[PDB]
Design an enzyme around this catalytic site. Structure first.
Site, short mmCIF file in Angstrom:
data_model
loop_
_atom_site.label_atom_id
_atom_site.label_comp_id
_atom_site.label_asym_id
_atom_site.label_seq_id
_atom_site.Cartn_x
_atom_site.Cartn_y
_atom_site.Cartn_z
N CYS B 321 31.76 34.58 51.94
CA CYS B 321 32.30 34.83 50.58
C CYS B 321 31.27 35.64 49.70
CB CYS B 321 32.75 33.54 49.90
SG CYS B 321 34.16 32.73 50.70
N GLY B 324 27.40 31.81 49.99
CA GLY B 324 27.57 30.93 51.13
C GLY B 324 27.06 29.53 50.92
N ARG B 327 32.15 27.82 48.14
CA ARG B 327 33.38 27.96 48.94
C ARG B 327 33.12 28.01 50.45
NH1 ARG B 327 34.25 32.99 45.48
NH2 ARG B 327 32.06 32.70 46.10
N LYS B 363 24.05 23.36 45.87
CA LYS B 363 23.38 23.15 44.58
C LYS B 363 23.95 21.93 43.80
CE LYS B 363 22.17 27.52 42.81
NZ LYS B 363 22.89 28.43 41.87
#
Lengths: 487, 487
Positions: B321, B324, B327, B363
């Protein structure tokens, strides 16, 4: 403080004790289930009217979790509410001096204080626009660049699509733009950021834009590019224009270390200066072990180079290094100061800062710590610049209209935030924060006490200054170091 | 509080009043000179022994300015010192529950709690390493990537210099690495970040690495790449591998909007759910106006695609995407859950999170708000994942060992920080924060209360799940929305 028989409301609501510290608000359940709410996580906190079953206290957290408590006594709830408000306050610009400072100016006097410096008159002072250069509506609504001014000057040959393309190939969109034009020699000082020359990435519009700047110079078709090496010491690019793709460029190393090395250097300086119970030998040993003098020495050298490329071998120069806002700002300014008399004027030095740092987005809020941002994004880059302008007054005691007092007073209000001039990191947010309507300007304040800052030994009125550097002449600024610690 | 006859020491030291608020410590001079010190600017504050001329209070500011005061009475100084300490406290991990929570484990029991999940045994469970794949010391000291694990699995054909090169062409250095291998079908799920395919930037090692993954598949030489379009909706690149330079690739749109659109969507959800005095018609109108269901629906579709590419038309897939980690983490996990029975186990679901989010740097601290970081870097990306795993339990009420209780309890401790598992944004800082020695693991805590989370309707033991999507079947998770606001 501790409150017993508190209810944490839940429709799927058990009783417990609610503890309050400076670090967090903790709720211990009847069983043992502890619920922690760190004050720096609270977004909002309301207190609705007292009910027959207690005083409701709703807390909204930064992770979108809403908590509902029922504190038995209103008195107890009122103390928790008022202390949660004090402990949940976050860093804001509106907390700074400039927003409260009001020197009885009937607003009309304030508006005239901002209109004091007009850059559209500074560029017009240098004969810009002309047939060689023009203004572009490319940033009319901060479209092409965010950390750049609404008004930008680019070659009259280069068109609108050339600009849009270059901005996309330059770091932060800080594309080659006019930082200063020399009317008489027809040479130019241009500023930008490093190009994203990744592996073999090529941008035609960028190649054509650099070509336009050289072609705008009718004396020298050879251009200069100032940056850092070996292997660049400042991911998608080694930030060098490929000389095979820009077949009209010359490269020169600035040798000026990054913001992290500047901040580190200053720490050891202030660590030596601030300490006592020393020796004269040990003090300067530690003072030079900081390599702070080596830093300002290498800053000046880049200005000395840039002035020599304009004066001696007439040629347009492009300064960028990496992001084109720290060292690029330092060199572009120091350089232009060496070749123009008007910037050595008290009002001329104000217009110089206003253009090269204020309008062309220098990160004052980040490097000076106006809020509680990143400690790593903090460095003395505009302090280093002022220390360089000091060495020039010490070098040429007649060339400058002002003295050591004007520099130290500019250095005072940047660290005082009494005036809304250096508030933020770019001109886009300065307009968003409505500084021209909510605060007061520094420049007309200093345009009152001119007498004290004024150099009486100054020569009333047009050449190029030649500062020398041989390690020896460069020595410590005790009045600078004194502002950080007054011992 | 207000203190009179205070001295702001300066060797170049005038008397004045010193005011103290929750926002700042203000010093007004005998003349009128105001000195402002915002509490969120204080780095340190010491209080040296009382002298015959007062109690010295030194304040160190975040811009390296040291301030020295002489407060006449020690009593007054002591109150200012203690309140400056409370008001200058900054966001820390050590303030979180996990560091204080101690359930009488004699340390030996704690060390065994971390060693519970061994990924070197998970990869070995899938027959990795073999002749097709191997382990690389490329991240042995977090050299090649920062937001990646110390142990990485790459094709046995691809060598050390191929890896170093690819990492330099991929955003954040998150290069194509094995996320899951299918022993039986010999197909692979690979994860990475977008490539920096700027203008016509080409990286040979990257082209060769993608080639190595297809060549590692002995059944299909055609590979898939999952990303976002039109024009990419997630500067130095449109993040697409150039199909003319990667002449062995197929592209498919995930259609999944970015983290800002996720957070915004959830706001309108919780804004509808949290409010009362509504109607059944108006509630769901506003619930669908949030488009939250449309978000989880489009998340599942990407997992449904990825499983179909492995199962139906045997072929290795590359999910990236943009960065990484959001999503890509969602799809890689949801996809692998649809094709492997072991991840549908209670312990197997723990090892799944441990690999795809914990080790491969999701994160959590940034998206969940563990400190006082960026509000814009906050989104419900792991909440969306769990809501997708819920729809699967609602779809297949026998395929999963656990139920709605296990998901909600995992969702509880991520927002509670009782356990040092989701603390930080990557495995490099988790090791730097010494979490394996300072905190306690969640996984062995849930490996005690299995009974409540356990699905009794579960089929004891190996096929691929086929979840359906037609807008209708997808409906609201009331027990999820209840955790944010318990009304």
């Amino acid at each position: 403080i501790r409150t017993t028989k508190v209810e944490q409301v839940k429709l799927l609501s058990l009783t417990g004790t609610l503890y309050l510290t400076a670090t967090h608000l903790l709720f211990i359940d009847s069983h043992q289930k502890e619920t922690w709410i760190l004050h720096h996580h609270i977004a909002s906190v309301e207190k609705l009217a007292l009910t027959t079953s207690g005083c409701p206290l709703v807390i909204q957290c930064k992770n979108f979790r809403t908590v509902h408590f029922i504190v038995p006594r209103e008195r107890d709830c009122h103390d928790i509410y008022n202390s949660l408000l004090q402990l949940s306050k976050q860093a804001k610009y509106e907390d700074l001096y400039a927003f409260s400072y009001n020197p009885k100016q009937n607003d009309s006097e304030r508006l005239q204080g901002w209109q004091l410096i007009d850059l559209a008159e500074e560029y017009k002072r240098m004969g810009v626009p002309n047939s060689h250069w023009q203004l572009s509506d490319a940033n009319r609504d901060y479209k092409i660049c965010e950390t750049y001014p609404r008004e930008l000057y680019v070659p009259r040959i280069a068109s609108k699509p050339i600009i849009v393309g270059s901005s996309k190939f330059r770091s932060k969109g800080r594309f080659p733009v006019l930082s200063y034009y020399h009317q008489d020699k027809e040479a130019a000082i241009c500023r930008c950021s490093q190009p994203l020359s990744g592996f073999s990435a090529r941008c035609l519009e960028d190649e054509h834009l650099l070509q336009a700047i050289s072609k705008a110079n009718p004396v020298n078709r050879y251009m200069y590019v100032m940056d850092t090496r070996p292997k660049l010491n400042a991911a998608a690019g080694k930030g060098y224009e490929n000389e095979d793709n820009y077949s009209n460029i010359r490269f020169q190393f600035v040798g000026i270390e990054n913001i992290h090395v500047m901040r580190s250097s200053l720490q050891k300086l202030l660590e030596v200066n601030g300490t006592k119970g020393l020796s004269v030998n040990d003090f300067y040993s530690g003072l030079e072990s900081s390599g702070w003098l080596r830093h300002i020495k290498a800053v000046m050298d880049a200005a000395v180079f840039l002035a020599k490329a304009i004066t001696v071998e007439n040629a347009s120069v492009l300064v960028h290094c990496s992001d084109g806002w720290d060292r690029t700002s330092q060199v572009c300014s120091l350089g232009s100061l060496l070749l123009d008399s008007y910037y050595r004027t008290i009002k001329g030095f104000m217009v110089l800062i206003e253009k090269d740092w204020i309008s062309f987005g220098h990160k004052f809020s980040e490097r000076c710590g106006q809020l509680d941002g990143d400690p790593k994004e903090v460095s003395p880059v505009f302090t280093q610049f002022l220390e360089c302008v000091w060495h020039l007054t010490e070098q040429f005691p007649q060339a400058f209209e002002f003295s050591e007092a004007f520099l130290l007073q500019i250095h005072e209000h940047i660290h005082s935030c009494q005036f809304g001039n250096f508030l933020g990191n770019c001109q886009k947010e300065r307009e968003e924060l409505k500084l021209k309507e909510k605060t007061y300007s520094l420049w007309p304040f200093l345009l009152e006490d001119q007498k004290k800052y004024l150099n009486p030994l100054y020569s009333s009125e047009f050449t190029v200054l030649e500062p020398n550097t041989v390690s020896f002449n460069f020595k410590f600024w005790r009045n600078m170091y004194h502002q950080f610690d007054r011992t």
